[PDB]
Symmetry: D2
Subunit: 461 residues, 4 copies
Amino acid sequence: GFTDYKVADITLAAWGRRELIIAESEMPALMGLRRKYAGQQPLKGAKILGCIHMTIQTGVLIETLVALGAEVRWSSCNIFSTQDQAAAAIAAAGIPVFAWKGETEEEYEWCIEQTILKDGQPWDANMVLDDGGDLTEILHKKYPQMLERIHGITEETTTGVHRLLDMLKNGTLKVPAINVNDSVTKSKNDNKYGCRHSLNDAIKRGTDHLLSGKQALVIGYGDVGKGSSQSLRQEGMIVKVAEVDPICAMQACMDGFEVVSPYKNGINDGTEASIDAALLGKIDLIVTTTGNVNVCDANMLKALKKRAVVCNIGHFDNEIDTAFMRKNWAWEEVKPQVHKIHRTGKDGFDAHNDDYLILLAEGRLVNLGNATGHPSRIMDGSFANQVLAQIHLFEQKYADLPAAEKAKRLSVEVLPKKLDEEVALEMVKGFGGVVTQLTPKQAEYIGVSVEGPFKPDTYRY
Amino acid sequence: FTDYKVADITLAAWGRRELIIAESEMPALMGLRRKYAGQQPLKGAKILGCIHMTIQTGVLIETLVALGAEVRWSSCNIFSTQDQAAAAIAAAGIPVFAWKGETEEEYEWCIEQTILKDGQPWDANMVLDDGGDLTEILHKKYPQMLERIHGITEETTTGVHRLLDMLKNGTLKVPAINVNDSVTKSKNDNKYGCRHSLNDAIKRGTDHLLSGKQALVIGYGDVGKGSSQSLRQEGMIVKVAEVDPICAMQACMDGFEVVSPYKNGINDGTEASIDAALLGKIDLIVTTTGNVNVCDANMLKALKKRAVVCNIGHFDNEIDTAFMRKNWAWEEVKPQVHKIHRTGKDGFDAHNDDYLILLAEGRLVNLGNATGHPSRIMDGSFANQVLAQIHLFEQKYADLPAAEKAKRLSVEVLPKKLDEEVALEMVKGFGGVVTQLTPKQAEYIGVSVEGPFKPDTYRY
Amino acid sequence: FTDYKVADITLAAWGRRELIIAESEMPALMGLRRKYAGQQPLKGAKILGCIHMTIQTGVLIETLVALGAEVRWSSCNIFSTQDQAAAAIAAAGIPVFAWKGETEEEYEWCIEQTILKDGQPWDANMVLDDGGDLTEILHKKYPQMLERIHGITEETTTGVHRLLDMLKNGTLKVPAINVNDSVTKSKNDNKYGCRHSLNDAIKRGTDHLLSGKQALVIGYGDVGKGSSQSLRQEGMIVKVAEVDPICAMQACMDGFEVVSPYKNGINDGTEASIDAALLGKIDLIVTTTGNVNVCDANMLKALKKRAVVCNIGHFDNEIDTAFMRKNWAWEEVKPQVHKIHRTGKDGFDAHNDDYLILLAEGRLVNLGNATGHPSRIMDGSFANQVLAQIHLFEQKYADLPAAEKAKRLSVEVLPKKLDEEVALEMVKGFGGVVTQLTPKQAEYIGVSVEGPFKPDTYRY
Amino acid sequence: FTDYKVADITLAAWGRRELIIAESEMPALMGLRRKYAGQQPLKGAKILGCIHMTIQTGVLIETLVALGAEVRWSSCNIFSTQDQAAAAIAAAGIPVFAWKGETEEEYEWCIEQTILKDGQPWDANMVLDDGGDLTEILHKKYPQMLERIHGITEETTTGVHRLLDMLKNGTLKVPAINVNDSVTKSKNDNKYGCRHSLNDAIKRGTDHLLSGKQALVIGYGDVGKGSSQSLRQEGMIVKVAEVDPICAMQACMDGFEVVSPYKNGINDGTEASIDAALLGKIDLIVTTTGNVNVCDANMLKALKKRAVVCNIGHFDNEIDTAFMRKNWAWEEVKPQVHKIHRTGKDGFDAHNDDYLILLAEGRLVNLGNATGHPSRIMDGSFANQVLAQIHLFEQKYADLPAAEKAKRLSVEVLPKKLDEEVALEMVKGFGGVVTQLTPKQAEYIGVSVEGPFKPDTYRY
Ligand SMILES: NC(=O)c1ccc[n+]([C@@H]2O[C@H](COP(=O)([O-])OP(=O)(O)OC[C@H]3O[C@@H](n4cnc5c(N)ncnc54)[C@H](O)[C@@H]3O)[C@@H](O)[C@H]2O)c1
Ligand SMILES: NC(=O)c1ccc[n+]([C@@H]2O[C@H](COP(=O)([O-])OP(=O)(O)OC[C@H]3O[C@@H](n4cnc5c(N)ncnc54)[C@H](O)[C@@H]3O)[C@@H](O)[C@H]2O)c1
Ligand SMILES: NC(=O)c1ccc[n+]([C@@H]2O[C@H](COP(=O)([O-])OP(=O)(O)OC[C@H]3O[C@@H](n4cnc5c(N)ncnc54)[C@H](O)[C@@H]3O)[C@@H](O)[C@H]2O)c1
Ligand SMILES: NC(=O)c1ccc[n+]([C@@H]2O[C@H](COP(=O)([O-])OP(=O)(O)OC[C@H]3O[C@@H](n4cnc5c(N)ncnc54)[C@H](O)[C@@H]3O)[C@@H](O)[C@H]2O)c1
Ligand SMILES: Nc1ncnc2[nH]cnc12
Ligand SMILES: Nc1ncnc2[nH]cnc12
Ligand SMILES: Nc1ncnc2[nH]cnc12
Ligand SMILES: [Rb+]
């Protein structure tokens, strides 16, 4: 009798369930939590609004939250990232989900609204799980009465955390949050190694281009840029890296990359004359990794080598000036999420034109748009942290605290290191790794407990 | 001029040649000489320095002097000095007491010669240390001297741990800067420096092929990460041991198998707990931990015949070399390379097959068997050292009123802005070009166009 | 009448879009289209082709046609066709009989539709093959057709072996060119193509993380070298098995541990000879040999639960899939991905932990679960194919008198000069610039300025 | 015993210590010493040897002697001898004439001391050469000695070229084995040896950081492949130049940019032909070609200030050092390391910034600035040398009548079966386990279970 969902094709559910069963075997930290906490039901009474890519990996997260006692209502945080078989399996399990691959922007917003509302009125939500901040923003702008009864937000990704910290600085954040991104077992796992796995994967699925021997430019060298650069260099690309942060640039040099700017002497003067046209005319592939705006701009797009591939793996598509391309150039769909963009003019194109770019996923995050995002065994870490964060904020019960106590608890915090380590141990055991136990003398010598935590909070790994 | 002791002053011209090359490899340090020449911010500084007396240290010393300081110098390891560097510094009229191959007694004597001038304590007012030995001597044996010292700038992970322990116990007498935890130090020197210099030292000592052979790296912190890469890039099959599951996770994702020398990771000190099958396949063991007895006697007994054993952590006690001296016969191959014959203590057969090769008697192998990190990496570390010396010297802690000293007695890192400035100089040295944010982009991500670019929480 | 059979003709426009992209990635092959357009060297050629019906093959087919040939085409594997490529070729008026997911009976029928036109033998005079199946069928079932065929151009290592066996036995009826052993084929396609496409296929089938996990690659020839790199570059811990000690030496030096599935390398046919400890740690096994039963039933029994099993050699009999069909229960995950439940033959528990994942039913995994090698690699192989077709067609073997045909049966390779010319075009496609020898330099090393640059003995 | 000339006989005990270690790293060569000691297959052989007098060569020499040979030895390069090795060999009663840092006159004198004993031709009957200098002297100056010599075993690519030129011209007087082209030589020593030893030598000479810097490798044959990897694995950004498009294709697919020093690759002798922008960004140039003047005067003028220049090909004429001696001022940094000041010929400013660093005066840098290839790599080369000596000595060419000599006067390689046997011992040295084919698998691929496993056409 269950009908409170909207997905592309419910008949994909059996396939999705087969893939979920495989994924559980790849997610020991998350499944460890499900086993440890199922008896105690720490999320009994939790009512979680979730907005994160509706993949098979997210499916295992959802069913872990449910197994621990939560009810949820779910949507994706990107128009192209849903795996339709995952969405179907979740709907078939009696869980409200509003998600499909290839949403319009209007549909995207509608799906988030369907999580917020049940039977035309605000749902009795008391927790939020977000990736990128779009749900968080809608709640603050449109549903402040619902935020009165929400105990916390657990935010997945670097861009979302930045948005939360801006709200906090402005005094507009209404409920506390956990920055899940900055667990080591998230940032230095998912953001880096996930993109190492999934960037080359997506480019191959979209284009089937040989990468070896060809020239790439990676814009950014944070966690995503590091992983992305390795994804390409391990395939034999000649990778150049751009950065605004000299410390990240130093890392790129030491890691064996040439550090370059798209602009002469690194200065964008707003004009085509500031573009290093010689550089860009040699680039076969450009990848944006920044979380910033317009880092592959119109003038860069004009200067790129004919037939270059352009993609973004940061959270939002505005890293690349796709609006310029929609206004000025002709788009030819190769296949879904792969477009040739003909630089010859706006209205039509010659089928045999040589002067085009290939854009993946319309500039949306390419790993999820053209492939399946990060693998289960990587997302295990991120999602174990999500579950721990949900437990922590739900147990703290912020919404029920008196005003004076709320004032002390209204913050954006990370999980304690001890929990980050516990996640990591389960990941290591999944690989068959064996951690050494400190002797009492060794523990004393370095000033730690034998069980951890092992590093000071200052440590950067 | 006679206020020095080095192996051979005639090596000075060679040392100077290598200093002139090193200056061209150290743009951040040379940039500081140009920037601060006029101000002379270290005029009146009298710096006790204790750090490996290499060519790179020579460029650091001469930068401090160019900025107005006087110094008195020693090495922080018995095997790390480059005798041509020490000679060039002595020839420049700078007091230095250092040679490659000191005894422990000579090591202590050399530190004492920095502390004393013309037979009595120098009027020192600053300290630059690597590992904490000088810091410890001043606190334990010369506490009066610390009354006049404005600060300590500490280079390395082990030294910082020692400082933080003193602060927690209330025994630290002057403020310190943790130079190690600049990003342009920890995530440059500790990691990439060991990547360059570990394989270098093993080749110079043994000339062993590394490709195709089995290594075990104990630890996967900064040093262990770099060391593991040093070996894997040469084609070794590297396994990694760790106590910290987060570091272990990184090792897995970086493509290493994570193993323990002990069955199920449980080290009860018995021979039975050793994974003998594992250790019997290992051709090379490298310790990287900063901890004690992480390559223990039972592990040494179980290693494959003819395995190489070395340490790249600060102190030799990572490896139970004392057990080896007490029980097994040492055959010097050449300086800093010993075959250790497991057949007994008193004599050996020249053709015995059952030996280990120990490098540098367990002392830090990069400096012992090679020349440590390259100039262009040490540029970052040492630019931070000079900035830290300037900051603490200008603060003049010793002369502050009591209430202000209480607020300033701390162990701090340099500001991120300065870490970034050092990094920019390093990048420019490679010919790298950093992009400048537009005003709209800087607003979008919430930073100034000039930086800093990341919040203090950022881990890189 | 539609003289083709494809899955879905409406995919033609998509195929054509991808052909146009592929032409831009295949400069050697497109260069041949332009160079030989005027001459029409294949005018009058009627080519039976049997090779994976991919986008890359489509560019090859259209090159042959552009040079004057007519063709009739089928795939050489039941899972390797890209339906959009087949559709684009059919839509262009070229007879093609190919779809992804053929049965064995359909596979044979498709080859027969190339051989027969309108119910009788086509007047074929050339053969292009990959693996020998079309060659075998012609010799077995249509020997009279071979009286009119000038030659065979064979793509792959296994096909060449089959030809050489026929030649030794006196059963080969027409001469052949071994296209596999051009350097721009064997040391390009076989190696780098598998480097690109093996990890690709595993990701598409399973989306498994590879980093940190254990692989066993059986073989270290060209395919095995490329396959091992495909996995090691992703961060797998790769072990390699080999029978050839020279290839095993290369694996060691390349940084791999060389191991056998069998104790001391000796297979006794029983479970007692299996190294169960080794196989119980393997997450992924890949066969690369061109041999038979190199991942046998006893190995399959001993593999770690939930290991992935795949083959990238030409034929599925590298793995004992017959044993698995007879004894274990198969659960389709999605097309070309099966969980094989080791609990028994008749049914399975949906939540069983004791299964293996088999890709492409053991058929070549790169083509079965992905799209095979990329266009820019296939450019080299297919340029060689075109050149080989030109050469044998021009030689006109079928028109020789009977006594001379007997004398002219051989299996030859293309000259090194042509291998170099193909390589130059490939290099230019990367933007690479080859240096020209001066006359003095050419004299010094004993070559012509134009090449060839190496003696025929050279191994690259 | 006095029939020797070395730098310092007192280094002998050190050399012997290192020989004992090297024996443990050379299982193929030691396996041959054990296998053939009883039979004494080189009893009566009198071998003139000319090859780098290293510890590795010492193990080779002592193997030949252990199998019954007498020898008289010299080095094939002025900088390649390890003086402790030479001393250990002389102390063993073996005639050796070699030291590190010979003049060219001393080099020639040392070869002559091998040829002559007590002022008259020795009764030589075999030749072991690396590079052909000894071979050339015998043919030009001592043709009567060649009448009684059974063969030459030639180590390296350049020497083989010289032999093949003699054969083509009809001037080769005795047969030869091309030891270079064993797989366990060419695709071991030439490639992996340079991978190990190139970065080693650059670090020992300069201690420069390599990571992040730009290199240009001239050539991409076996030595250039290994050299490129030596630098790329350290994090250099490596560009490759080639004249052979097949090798260039390999470089592209291996992840390198292929560039020419010259515009459009045309080396017309003009300054304007140099790609000034390219050469002005290069920090390190390495020549690997075996050709002449591949790092020419105009390239040297255009290089980035403070670039390192070195050669790893056999002869120094790869680089135009003569132009540098004629035009620029040389400042010795330390032995085998010179700064070459581009400011003029007569003097230099000690602080000039416009210099290059040349290693080993352009002579092969691995041996000149380090210790050449490691023992476990040289094991393969030298096992092949021993086998080749046995083969030619047993064939007894000198004793054949003129008509029979004509049939055997050739340059040949060892049989593949022997190449495989060498490789097996190398793999066992790593602990590798090769799988044994079942009889059915051997039949399926058409080989004997024991090998050989590949046809003679196979390129590995
Ligand atoms: N696709 C995925 O699956 C995935 C995974 C994790 C995070 N993300 C997203 O990827 C983005 C990056 O995340 P991160 O964790 O790497 O952030 P980060 O802050 O670690 O790195 C971003 C980097 O971009 C650099 N940068 C900013 N503006 C630049 C410019 N104009 N030119 C060059 N470099 C510039 C910064 O200096 C910084 O080092 C965010 O939007 C994050 O939410 C996506
Ligand atoms: N040789 C050099 O030039 C050089 C360079 C920099 C630092 N250092 C020294 O190297 C040492 C390591 O420094 P670091 O910055 O990498 O420190 P770190 O704290 O980053 O790393 C040390 C690692 O050792 C691990 N560890 C501790 N006990 C262990 C055990 N019993 N088994 C396995 N792993 C264990 C820890 O979990 C930790 O991750 C320190 O002594 C430091 O001063 C040496
Ligand atoms: N999937 C693809 O796209 C693709 C590409 C090229 C070739 N191929 C096919 O791949 C196969 C291998 O081709 P290749 O060119 O690498 O051949 P190869 O002869 O170079 O290599 C095969 C290797 O297998 C080894 N081997 C044989 N039996 C073995 C055993 N029992 N255990 C371990 N090692 C064993 C051999 O010693 C040899 O080195 C052939 O079937 C070929 O036709 C496939
Ligand atoms: N230092 C060592 O220990 C060592 C080891 C083995 C061989 N060698 C020597 O190294 C040299 C190279 O040997 P190899 O086995 O690699 O030979 P090779 O024939 O395999 O490779 C030499 C390469 O140089 C290229 N080349 C020639 N002229 C060129 C030019 N003007 N510009 C660019 N590329 C050019 C050729 O095309 C060829 O591919 C020989 O002198 C050999 O005797 C030295
Ligand atoms: N070269 C060097 N000089 C000084 N301290 C160092 N620490 C590591 N390498 C060093
Ligand atoms: N893409 C491809 N097309 C045709 N044959 C192939 N063999 C391997 N990959 C191939
Ligand atoms: N170590 C070595 N000994 C002799 N010949 C060599 N050629 C290269 N390295 C060598
Ligand atoms: Rb150094």
